[PDB]
Every structure is written in C-alpha cells, then in structure tokens.
Design a protein around this nucleic acid. Structure first.
Ligand SMILES: [K+]
Ligand SMILES: [K+]
Ligand SMILES: [K+]
Ligand SMILES: [K+]
Ligand SMILES: [K+]
Ligand SMILES: [K+]
Ligand SMILES: [K+]
Ligand SMILES: [K+]
Ligand SMILES: [K+]
Ligand SMILES: [K+]
Ligand SMILES: [Mg+2]
Ligand SMILES: [Mg+2]
Length: 1333
RNA sequence: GGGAAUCCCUUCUGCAGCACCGUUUUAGAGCUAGAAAUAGCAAGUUAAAAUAAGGCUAGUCCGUUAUCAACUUGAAAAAGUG
DNA sequence: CAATACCAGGTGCTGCAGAAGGGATTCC
DNA sequence: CCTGGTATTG
C-alpha cells in the first residue's frame, strides 16, 4: 500500500491530504470513542488544521520592562524617604503615612485626609500659595529662608519621580544657554575666516528669531531675511540651518566633490564632520563647532522660555508662565464669551461631554481636541486674535503636565534639585551629608549592558557582582562588575567561529580581519599585458607592494588606481587587463586609516610587534560602548600615546563582529609549511589559494585541524529546533503543527512511510511610511510636505505614497506630477511582472504614462536612465528609493536584462529557494529517512519535494479547478491535495528534476524548458498537440492520463466531507482590558489591589477566560439555601487559573458550588466542538458565547461559476476562451438562485439567524436587475453569514447585515462534545445529556 | 543543487536601559437664593498613590511569548491506545 | 432571555546580537 | 482590525 502526503503550510492553517497511486484520496473507517451510539465513522483522508496566529515576544517584553521601571521608580522614592525618615519623624510623624494612603477613601484612611499638613487650614493655605508644584520648586530654588521639611521632600520627590530623559551625555547649562551670545560668536568665527566677506549682524534679534515657536526652515528664512547680502543656502545660512537641525549640503559652499551633507543628529556626523574637515582644512573646525553650540542653545530654548538671569529654576519658571498665561487667557475668554456668545457659555464651561474647557479639564478632551473645538468659536468672536495666535502656536491654555514634556533632559531637573539641596542643607545637616546621595538617586541609570540586577532567578539576567550584597545607586560601581557584565552582554549573543567552535570571533573592524579580507580578495586578481601568454596571479611581493602603496595610502583602491599607481608606476605597463575585481576593491583597510589619523605614527601601525596591542585596542573599542570603561581599558597603553591621542582614541568606537576567529586567520599553521592562513593569503607560490581552497585542500593541515576542532552539543528537541529557526513565530507555529500532522498521518497508514511528501509554504506601518517620507524629504531639502500635508493613514494609498517617495515627480520624465490627478497616472513595475512577480514599492514606480518607460519587454530604456539617473541618485541618498530599486532602474546601462536573467526569473517563479522552507524540508527528511546503506550514505525512502504556490495556482486556473477562499476552509485541504498530485506527477515525468525539487544531495534553452515544464498536463499547447497519455521516457511508466486523472482530481475537490479542525487553545495573556474604570455598583468590576473595593475605587472589567469548565454540582437556592442540582459552564479567567488548578474543589466551592462531581469536571478550552441536532455544530467562543461550528460544502459547479462570474483573479488566456467562459456564465445564470437556495437551506439548518437570513433574501431579491458580475461579487460576501467561526458583519451591495451572536451556551450542556485529534480523524464523542440526570 | 568570506542594501527575530502622557481614588474649604427640587454665579492648569491580582526564590528579582484533543498509566516528565 | 450598541492603553528615545531577501567579487 | 465583555432596553 503506497501513498503520498501533500502539505500546505500557512500562518493560520496546515492543509493536508493523502493520495494513492492514481492521485486518489483514500477513505477509512475510524474508531469512535466515548459514550454515544456511534462506534466508528467514515473519513476521507483530506483536511486542514486551523489555528490562531502565533504571537511575537515583543508585547510581553515591553510590558516586562515597563514593570521593572515601575518597580525601580518606586524604589527611588523609597530611597529618598529612607534618607528623610528620622528628621521627618521629628517634624511630622505621619507625613509619609498620609502620602502612602492618599488614594484611600476617608472611611478607610487611618490618618487625617489632608496629605501635606494634616489640617484643612494649612492645606488650603499651601494650595493658595503654590497652585502648581512648580511654584514650590521655584520658591525652594530661589529663596534663602529655611523651609518646611515636608515641602522640601515634595519638591525633591517630584523631581526624582519624573526625572526626564538621558539622551544627552555630560553636564548642561554650559553658557550655551544664550542663543544671542552663541549667534554672536558664530558671527565672530565666520568673520574671522572670511575677512573680505563679513556679515553685519547689528540690529538682528537672534534670540526671538531662532527660539521662536516655528518650523526650522521658517526660522532659517526669517534670520536670513534679516541679512541683506546673504542667501539661505550660502555658507552662513547653511551653518544656521545646521544649528536649527536641518540637513545642509556644504558641498557648494566649499566647491567640494564629496557631498558634504551634515545633520547634527545623525550618528555619522562625528565622522561626517572630520571627513569634511579633511578637505577644506582645520581652520573651519572652530566654525563648525561654534554652530554646534548654537544648536544646543536653540534646543534648550524650546524647553526654557524664560530669562535665566532672574531665577535658577528656568523650567519651573516656564511652567509657572504656562500657568499665568492660562489664568489670564481663561479670564479673558470667559469675559469674551459672556459678552458675545452668552448661550454657549454653559456648553463650553460645564459640559464634560463636549470638547470645550469643561471637557478639557474634567472630561476626556485632549489639548488637540480642545483646540479643534474652540478655534471656530474664537474665529467667530471679536477680540480673540491674540488667543488665536497662541492656539496656532499650540500655546493656548496649556497645562503643566503634557505630552510634549519628553523634551526635558534630566540635567534640568537635576539643576533644580541640586539648587534646592544647596539652599536647605544650610539648615538641615542630613541634607548636606546626603546631598550627593539624593543627586545620585536622580542621576543613576542601570546601564543597558548590565541588565536586571538579579540573583539567579531571572532567565533574562547576565549581570555578575563583585561582592554579594544588595545593590543600590550609591554602591553600584563597587558591587556590580561592570566590565564582566558588559562583556557578557555581548558574548552571550555573538557567534563563535564555525570552523573552530571554541574560538571567539574577531571584531569586524580589527586590523588583522581587514588584512585577511583585503588579501583574500587580492590573491584572486589576475592581469594580462601584451607580451604575456596567459593571465598571471599577483606574486607575494606584488601583493605586498600593492598593499603598501595603495591600500595603506587610500581608504578605497579603485581599478584605475591599480592600473596607474601600480602597474604603470612600478611595472611600467601602459595597458593592462584586470580580472577578479570590478571598479574598485570591495575590501579595505579602514581601521588602519582611522588609527593613522588618530595616532599619526605609520611606523607604529606597520610594526608587527604592536599587532597584539592594536588588536586589543580595537577589541576595547568594539566590545564596549561606555566612554569611561573604554578609557579605563585603554589605560595600560597610556604611556605609548599622547594624552591628546588618548582622548581622540577614546572617542573612536566600532560596532560589529566578523565571522572568523583570530586563531583561524593567523593562529593555526599547516604542519609542513609552518604557515598560517594569512601567510598563504600573502604568498602561496603560483597557486594563490584563497580561504576556501586553503581549508578544503587535502595536501594541507588546515582541513584536518578544522574537522578535529568540531564539537556537537546536546541535541535540540523538535520544538527547540523549530524555535531557533530564523523566521516569524507565526510560520514556526505552522511548521511544528505540520510535523505533528505528518506523524499522525503516518500512524494512520499503519506506520508505513509515504513515497513522497510535497510541501508548499505560503508567502503602525503607516507610522513607518510617514517616517520614511519625512526623513527623505528633509534630507532632500524639499518643501513638498509644506505644500501638501498628509496623515500616515493616507500613505496606505499606493499612488500617494509613491508620489511622496518620488517628491511629486514622474520617475521616468523629469517633470512634476499632480496630486489631484493620481487616478490618471500609472504604477509600473521596474522589472516587468511577467519576469519578476514583485508588487512591492521596491519594484514599483509612479509615472504619468507607462509608455514613457520604453519597451515593455525589458527594464527601463537607456534613454530614460540617461535622463533620470541623477534624480534617482538623489532619491537613493534620501532613502526614498532603495539600492536594489536604483539598480533595477539603471540596469539598461549595464546591458539591461540578459536572456540568462529572464531564464533565472522563470526558474525562481517555479523553484523554491527560501531558507525557512528548506529547513522544514530538512526536518521532515531527517525524521523520515534514518537508515544508511553499504556505503554509509543516507537511504532516501521518502522524497521531500517543495513547490511554490504558482505551480498549483496556474494548474487550478488552467484546468478550471478554481478556488474561492471566502466560501469555506476547504481550499487549504484542496491546495494540499493538488500539491501532492502536481509534485508527484512532476517528478515522475522528469526524474532529472529531483536535484531541483527534492531535498538532499543555453539561456534560451532553460528559459523555454522552465516556461514549458508544465505543458505535459495539457492536451494542446499554444499550436502543438500532445498525447492523451503521458509517460516517463526511460521507465515507460505512466504519469498522467488526461482522460481519467483529471476526473479523479475533480471528484476529490467535489467531496463534501473534509476534516476541518480548529485547534482548541487555552487563552493566555492579559488578565482583562487594561482600562482603569471609575467606581460603579457592578459585580463585573475587579479590584486593582486586594483591599481596593471597586465600588469605592473603580477597577477593571472584561476579563479573558483561559478556559471554561463543565461543573455538575448543587448550588444553594433562595433565602432558605435549599440545595438545587445544576449543570453549567464556568469560565475560569486567566487570573483565576493558577488558583483553580491548585485545588479545583476548593476553588469551585468558594464560587458557590456544593457536592461537585469531581470526576465529571470537563476542561473546555476555546473552540471546543459541540454537535447538536441535524448536524448543527457550535464552538466554544467563551463561557457565555458560541461560534458557528459548521462548514458550507458548496458544490464544485457553484464554486467555479462564482469564480468565473465574479471575475475572480483574471480571465486571461485567449479571447475565444474568455468568450466561452462568459457564455457559460450566461448559460448558467439560474445558478445564482440555486446558490442562494443552498445558502438558505444551510442557514435554516445550522446558522439559525431568521432576521439576518430574511434581510439577506430581501437584499438579493432587490438587486436582481444588477449586472451578473456584481451580483456574484456580493454573493461572495454573503458567505460570511455561513462561514465557520465567530459571527461577523457583512455588506450585500449597500445593505449592511450585522452579526447574529450566540450569547448563550446552555444548549451545549446537553449536546455531544467532540474531542478531535490534530487531523480530526480520531474522535471521542461525549453525550453531555447523560450528565446531571 | 547545496555551502563560505567580503562589499552595497533591505527586512525581520530576540534582549536590555529609559522618558512623557493617560486613567483611577483622594486632597486642593465652592458661594448665594430657596425646606427641597433647583437657579444664578464663582472655580478649573496641581499632587499623592496604583498601573496587570500578585509570588517566593525576597532579587532594585519574577508575573501577558512559545507549548496544549480525549483516554490509559504515571506525582509529573512521558510513553502507549484506534 | 432578543436586538443592539459601544468599547478596547498610547507616544517618544538609546544600546546590542543574529538570520535572511536582493544584487556583486572570489572560491568549496 | 477582530470579537468577546458589558450595559441597556425590552
Ligand atoms: K493569542
Ligand atoms: K478617617
Ligand atoms: K537676505
Ligand atoms: K481632559
Ligand atoms: K567592487
Ligand atoms: K563599541
Ligand atoms: K603619554
Ligand atoms: K499562548
Ligand atoms: K476635589
Ligand atoms: K484538538
Ligand atoms: Mg507592583
Ligand atoms: Mg500623570
């Protein structure tokens, strides 16, 4: 008995099918277990497993880290209170107790209800004197008077609890506060450099202009307008733009060939500046640094909007400014509305439901919503002009706690904290003794390279301690081994050398590593001149001369430099032909040049004695990112370099690791030669063996030692192995489910292994789109966003997203495009989709007319490339198009598409090459094929074939086996069946294809062949004809009978009984909706803390049921508490689950159930299956809701008619065939009614939604004069009524049908519960009516 | 076909460290005319505390991913069953 | 118990490792 | 978005 298995692996489904020799699907009697009439059931061996998507670990991680942050914020406050404890006990022995119980209702409060002072008079006085905390903060910073210790605590605690960000290293307010003085000094430096061309900055109010609440470009334009002989793109204008945060191009200013684009925010700027400074000299450094300072000032002027010479608390002062302007403008607005619009006043100032001031302060209205609500009211009235100015500046009626306070760096809160400590330490000795401690509480961060400060109970931690004691912010450096921890942080993630598994990989920017790469590329260079008979390798001496003369004097070595600066200068060649490198060498000695610039001792770099040292330095620059740790590690080499060189070395840092170890590159030595790998790369006679040849050469010791060095650790489990695969967790869920399905199918066939296994694997964001366009346009310098504003959601339209990625220009014509005309334009594939089935933005382009691309049979023409390459290069540098997009756009100048390229593209359409699919194939192959033959080579009993989806899709369209996904879930199983059929037949017809299609170990000709690989199924081609019976040429075995086999496929797809199984899963994750609801009299509310009665404090509702439980017991009834027998479904919530499982009987008795039949407790996860009358099925949606449990097996004729009539996919083919399909549609129009009838007879039997079915029948009878195509398209929508799973709404034409829900689970308590195996072929059926009698 | 190193680019998976809001209860004396309903006016910007209930291993740790038909054994892990 | 209607925590930043899709040089 | 929880209405 021989059979094959077809598999369709998806993110939410695994389709599976078993076929025999004749491409038939067997059917078996399967035993049925349980307590019902039925002992067995007939099953077709075809089906599909369905499951909810597997989730990434990201949400879990964000919640985990937020949890740790809340814990540590609490700990900061606790440290501060511990410092304050004794002296506060002297001042007020319950202050911290009142703070602790502030949340409690007065009934539950154990102390007086007024937190700060414990009596109403003092509290009211405090609030009258300090309406905001920032008033108190400013007072405590500025005043010289001794202050109440409780107010000191409140100020310091407010600073520490909300401390601000840590984006800026070092200390702050370094005289770079004033924008005027930094602008004046920028002018000073610029005029120092350009004495002949100076700027008159007198009368220019730099302060107001640069700190104004306006866009960067607008402030630049204002300042430039105040300077007559200066333009915004001149040198001074570019410096101001750099200070304002734009991306100016200094190329034109200094006549540079290198495009000197500088943005102060980019990580590359540190190099980007130095590079520029290399060309125009270091005289301009003092200029480009001066502007930098200005930037800082401007940034701080966004946060501090007050003169810093009247107070040492400019932040708190700016908050008080917010408060005062809020008060003044509120008084003014109240008076204005009273005078002019007295009827609206209430709505504006009393209705929390409306987005007025009342909703802004008391309701849920945001600042943005309030501005939107009140802008027309201000425009409508008189005297609102200043208020409107403030509104458009987003500076009207501001609160102090706002979404935009993320700008505030921690250094400013720290300045205020330090000032308060300095003031009050004169009166409180413990503040003086603990000043730096409190400052440390605010400033300290756990470094990202240290991780959780665990003690052996965190699977996420890696930190090691220098001593075993509790870590605090003050003893962190002494207790935590920061060096070992930072080293572990990297080494727990980095790969070892695969060749030498015990050896650490080298840093990517190591000197030795770049030597290895350069020499490995250089040995395979070859050259010819006139007198030479044959191209020659470079000798060792030649390669060393090329390295010393070119690679050690130029960052990049081009082929032209090789030809002229070596072959002409040294070898006196006037002409030479080079191979092995194109345009320029890929490898380079970049670290060598970095270190040559820093240390300025070429002899030091070339001396081998320093090799170790230099390696170590790069290691330190790579392994660590903290400048203090980098400094500590480079201290051993302090004697070798100047302090200046040591500082410049500190600043230089590298990221990334190589793939080979130092021992492999330059450690192990071939036994007879005594030479390392790098030694052979430098010189290897006339063979010039590279790395691969070296380690694979049987005449050398390298291969032997590599084989010897290998180890193998503990073998992964199946699940472990699948988890470690690189891929989406969703597809990995699919992969594991596929393996389990195959195991069960093999067990079904009596442990006989299949002949073949054919596998096919299936193929917010608007925020990323907006980010890409913002970056690209500001990097481009364009004003298209000024003239055409857009929301992220709008960028989901393909044409508009392309429009903005193309800066509003045609991609093939150097012209502007019109937004309002996008519907008239074309979206065109750069490489045609006949060759590359790519529809991403990466292979798409917006143009006025696709005709302007050139010829349609190839890549855009040479003329278009000549026209548009510069514009494309700008788009590439702005990251609005990718490098691949640019290369495909410009391929015509490189010969365009060759015939080999087109043959390749067709092959790619047919042969699967994704790594994850190969991993699935390897898993199945290693599970099936385990025996070895006489030569100890693997015996491949089971051939694992992988197919791409296009094969079976084209098969379905070519032979009219159409699929309509919306009709039911059968199409997954049908896909699996068709995969088995097509794959088995394809390798039977052409066994030579096995290399391509089976796991395990002229361009026109292949193009033709692979384009015509599937023609053997067809009876007529193009207009050649083919036999009825198709056989293998060598064996003579029959592979395809076009008379009988197609009939078999059709019968299989017509079969109504298909095993669709929805994977039952316990629900996990959040306990409930996160929303903290206000107090309410409802037993649905859940306490947020053990003693916070939701009726007094609010809380949560809407918990998730982890799984339900069938309970058969007795509950007390009435005032008499008479025991009454019950059978019911109890939803165990995720939060309740651990308690319920620790002791189910105690949990259930706590809920009210008595005398619980312990053995009759049935665990019922989500999607548990129940069958009732007339084959009607329900799935458990929850403890109190059900889902539809049936599939509508619509006959094949109706499915194919629906596909053809709706113009599902494309009709394509030939116009005569299109006419035949149209004539069939029109000849079978009655099918429409028949289809409806089917749906109706199904819905009345199984769906039971009388109202919705009647509304649907009315809607169908209403649109009977509509075109047939549209009626069919909407009949497709009708199947949502009958689809398996949760009910959902759907539209028939313009009529909307809301979902009918199954809000009661009582009936399943007497129905039949069906437990299904993973395939559903094995069932256990439990008559629940026989329970609770 | 499978694989390696390098260059240009892109995407995705996993981890750590932080910030700003939001919400919730309490505190920030509402006033006057009426017995009340209510009416007229005043006021509003701030804070504390919680932010999965919680756990033991008690750490400035852990608590939302992955994995899960039923039945027989088995504490379980597991294997076995048509 | 029907039909029905609303609701659902959000934003921003820093640092790091890896595999893998596409193109290119050289090899096993 | 989906779809299960919830209050409201009847
Ligand atoms: K889930
Ligand atoms: K009390
Ligand atoms: K000007
Ligand atoms: K609000
Ligand atoms: K190159
Ligand atoms: K580094
Ligand atoms: K020195
Ligand atoms: K789960
Ligand atoms: K209040
Ligand atoms: K199952
Ligand atoms: Mg907590
Ligand atoms: Mg807040």
């Amino acid at each position: 008995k021989k059979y094959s298995i077809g598999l369709a692996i998806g993110t939410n489904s695994v389709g599976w099918a078993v076929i025999t020799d004749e491409y038939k699907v067997p059917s078996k009697k399967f035993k049925v277990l349980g307590n019902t009439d039925r002992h067995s059931i007939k099953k077709n061996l075809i089906g599909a497993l369905l499951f909810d998507s597997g989730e990434t670990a990201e949400a879990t991680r964000l919640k985990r880290t937020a949890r740790r942050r809340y814990t540590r914020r609490k700990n900061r406050i606790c440290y501060l209170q511990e410092i304050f404890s004794n002296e506060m006990a002297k001042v007020d022995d319950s202050f911290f107790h009142r703070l602790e119980e502030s949340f409690l209702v007065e009934e539950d409060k154990k102390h007086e209800r007024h937190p700060i002072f414990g009596n109403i008079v003092d509290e009211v006085a405090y609030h009258e004197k300090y309406p905001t905390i920032y008033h108190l903060r400013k007072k405590l910073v500025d005043s010289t008077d001794k202050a109440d210790l409780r107010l000191i605590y409140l100020a310091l605690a407010h600073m520490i609890k909300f401390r601000g960000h840590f984006l800026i290293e070092g200390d702050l307010n370094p005289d770079n506060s004033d924008v005027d003085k930094l602008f004046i000094q920028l002018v000073q430096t610029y005029n120092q450099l350009f004495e002949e061309n100076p700027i008159n900055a007198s009368g220019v109010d730099a302060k107001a202009i640069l700190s104004a609440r306006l866009s960067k470009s607008r402030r630049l334009e204002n300042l430039i307008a105040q300077l007559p002989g200066e333009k915004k793109n001149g040198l001074f204008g570019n410096l101001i733009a750099l200070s304002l945060g734009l991306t100016p191009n200094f190329k034109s200013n200094f006549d540079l060939a290198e495009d000197a684009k500088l943005q102060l925010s980019k990580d590359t700027y540190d190099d980007d500046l130095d590079n520029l400074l290399a060309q125009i000299g270091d005289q301009y450094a003092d200029l480009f640094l001066a502007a930098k300072n200005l930037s800082d000032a401007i940034l701080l002027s966004d946060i501090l909007r007050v003169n810093t010479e009247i107070t040492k608390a400019p932040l708190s002062a700016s908050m008080i400014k917010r408060y005062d302007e809020h008060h003044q403008d509120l008084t003014l607005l109240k008076a204005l509305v009273r005078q002019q619009l007295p009827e609206k006043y209430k709505e504006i100032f009393f209705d929390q439901s409306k987005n007025g001031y009342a909703g802004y302060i008391d309701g849920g209205a945001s600042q943005e919503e309030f501005y939107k609500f009140i802008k027309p009211i201000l425009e409508k009235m008189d005297g609102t002009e200043e208020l409107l100015v403030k509104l458009n500046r987003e500076d009207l009626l501001r609160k102090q706690r706002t979404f935009d306070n993320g700008s505030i760096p921690h250094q400013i809160h720290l300045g205020e904290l330090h000032a308060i400590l300095r003031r009050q330490e004169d009166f409180y000795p413990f503040l003086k003794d603990n000043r730096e401690k409190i400052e440390k509480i605010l400033t300290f961060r756990i470094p990202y390279y240290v991780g959780p400060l665990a003690r052996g109970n965190s699977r996420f931690a890696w930190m090691t301690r220098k001593s075993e004691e509790t870590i605090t912010p003050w003893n962190f450096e002494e207790v935590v081994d920061k060096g070992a921890s930072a080293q572990s942080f990297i080494e727990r993630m980095t790969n070892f050398d695969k060749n030498l598994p015990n050896e650490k990989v080298l840093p990517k920017h190591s000197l030795l590593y770049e030597y290895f790469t350069v020499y490995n590329e250089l040995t395979k260079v070859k050259y010819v001149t006139e007198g030479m008979r044959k191209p020659a390798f470079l000798s060792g001496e030649q390669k060393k001369a090329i390295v010393d003369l070119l690679f050690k004097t130029n960052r990049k070595v081009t082929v032209k430099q090789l030809k002229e600066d070596y072959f002409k200068k040294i070898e006196c060649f006037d002409s030479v032909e080079i191979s092995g490198v194109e345009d320029r060498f890929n490898a380079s000695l970049g670290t060598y040049h970095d270190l040559l610039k820093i240390i300025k001792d070429k002899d030091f770099l070339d001396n081998e004695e320093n090799e170790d040292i230099l390696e170590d330095i790069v290691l330190t620059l790579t392994l660590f990112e903290d400048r203090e740790m980098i400094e500590e590690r480079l201290k051993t080499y302090a004697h070798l370099f100047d302090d200046k060189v040591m500082k410049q070395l500190k600043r230089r840092r590298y990221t990334g690791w190589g793939r080979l170890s130092r021992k492999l590159i330059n450690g192990i030595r071939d036994k007879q030669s005594g030479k390392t790998i790098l030694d052979f790369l430098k010189s290897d006679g006339f063979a010039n063996r590279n790395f691969m040849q070296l380690i694979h050469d049987d005449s050398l010791t390298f291969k032997e030692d590599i084989q010897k060095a290998q180890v193998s650790g503990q073998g992964d489990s199946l699940h472990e192995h699948i988890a470690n695969l690189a891929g989406s967790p969703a597809i990995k869920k699919g992969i594991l489910q596929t393996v389990k399905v195959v195991d069960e199918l093999v067990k079904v066939m009596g442990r006989h292994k299949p002949e073949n296994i054919v596998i096919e694997m299936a193929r917010k964001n608007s925020r990323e789109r907006m980010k890409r366009i913002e970056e690209g346009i500001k990097e481009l310098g364009s004003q298209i966003l000024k003239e055409h504003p857009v929301e992220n959601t709008q960028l989901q339209n393909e044409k508009l997203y392309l429009y903005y990625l193309q800066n509003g220009r045609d991609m093939y014509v150097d012209q502007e495009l019109d937004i309002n005309r996008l519907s008239d334009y074309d979206v065109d594939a750069i490489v045609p989709q006949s060759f590359l089935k790519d529809d991403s933005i990466d292979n798409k382009v917006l143009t006025r007319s696709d005709k302007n691309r050139g010829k349609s049979d190839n890549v855009p023409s040479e003329e278009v490339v000549k026209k548009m390459k510069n514009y494309w290069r700008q788009l590439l540098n702005a990251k609005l198009i990718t490098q691949r997009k640019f290369d495909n756009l410009t391929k015509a100048e490189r010969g365009g598409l060759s015939e080999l390229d087109k043959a390749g593209f067709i092959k790619r359409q047919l042969v699967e090459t994704r790594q994850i699919t190969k991993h699935v194939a390897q898993i199945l192959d290693s599970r099936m094929n385990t025996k070895y033959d006489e030569n100890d080579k693997l015996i491949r009993e089971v051939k694992v074939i992988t197919l791409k989806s296009k094969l079976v899709s084209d098969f379905r369209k070519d032979f009219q086996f159409y699929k309509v996904r919306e009709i039911n879930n059968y199409h997954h199983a049908h896909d699996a069946y068709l995969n088995a059929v097509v794959g088995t037949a394809l390798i039977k017809k052409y066994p030579k294809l096995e290399s391509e299609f089976v796991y395990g170990d002229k361009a026109t000709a292949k193009y033709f062949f692979y384009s015509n690989i599937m023609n053997f199924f067809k009876t007529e081609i193009t207009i050649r004809k083919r036999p009825l019976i198709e056989t293998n040429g060598e064996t003579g075995e029959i592979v395809w009978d076009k008379g009988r086999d197609f009939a078999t496929v059709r019968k299989v797809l017509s079969m109504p009984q298909v095993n669709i199984v929805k994977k039952t899963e316990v629900q996990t994750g959040g306990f409930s909706k996160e929303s903290i609801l206000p107090k309410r009299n409802s037993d649905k509310l859940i306490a947020r803390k053990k003693d916070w009665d939701p009726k007094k404090y609010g809380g949560f509702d809407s918990p998730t049921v982890a799984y339900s439980v069938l309970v058969v017991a007795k509950v007390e009834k009435g005032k008499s508490k008479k025991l009454k027998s019950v059978k019911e479904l109890l939803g165990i919530t995720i939060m309740e689950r651990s308690s319920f499982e620790k002791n189910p009987i105690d949990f259930l008795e706590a809920k009210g159930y008595k005398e619980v039949k312990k053995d009759l407790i049935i665990k019922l996860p989500k999607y548990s299956l129940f069958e009732l009358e007339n084959g009607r099925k329900r799935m458990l949606a929850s403890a109190g809701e059900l889902q539809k449990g049936n599939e509508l097996a619509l006959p094949s004729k109706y499915v194919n008619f629906l596909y053809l009539a709706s113009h599902y996919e494309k009709l394509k083919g030939s116009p005569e065939d299109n006419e035949q399909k149209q004539l069939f549609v029109e000849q079978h129009k009655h099918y429409l009614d028949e289809i409806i009838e089917q749906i109706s007879e199904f819905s009345k039997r199984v769906i039971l939604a009388d109202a919705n079915l009647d509304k649907v029948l009315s809607a169908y009878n209403k649109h009977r004069d509509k075109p047939i195509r549209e009626q069919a398209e909407n009949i497709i929508h009708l199947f949502t009524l009958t689809n398996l799973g949760a009910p959902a709404a759907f539209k028939y034409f313009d009529t909307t049908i809301d979902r009918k829900r199954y809000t009661s689970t009582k009936e399943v308590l007497d129905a039949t519960l069906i437990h299904q195996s993973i395939t559903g072929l094995y069932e256990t059926r439990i008559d629940l009516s026989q329970l609770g009698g």
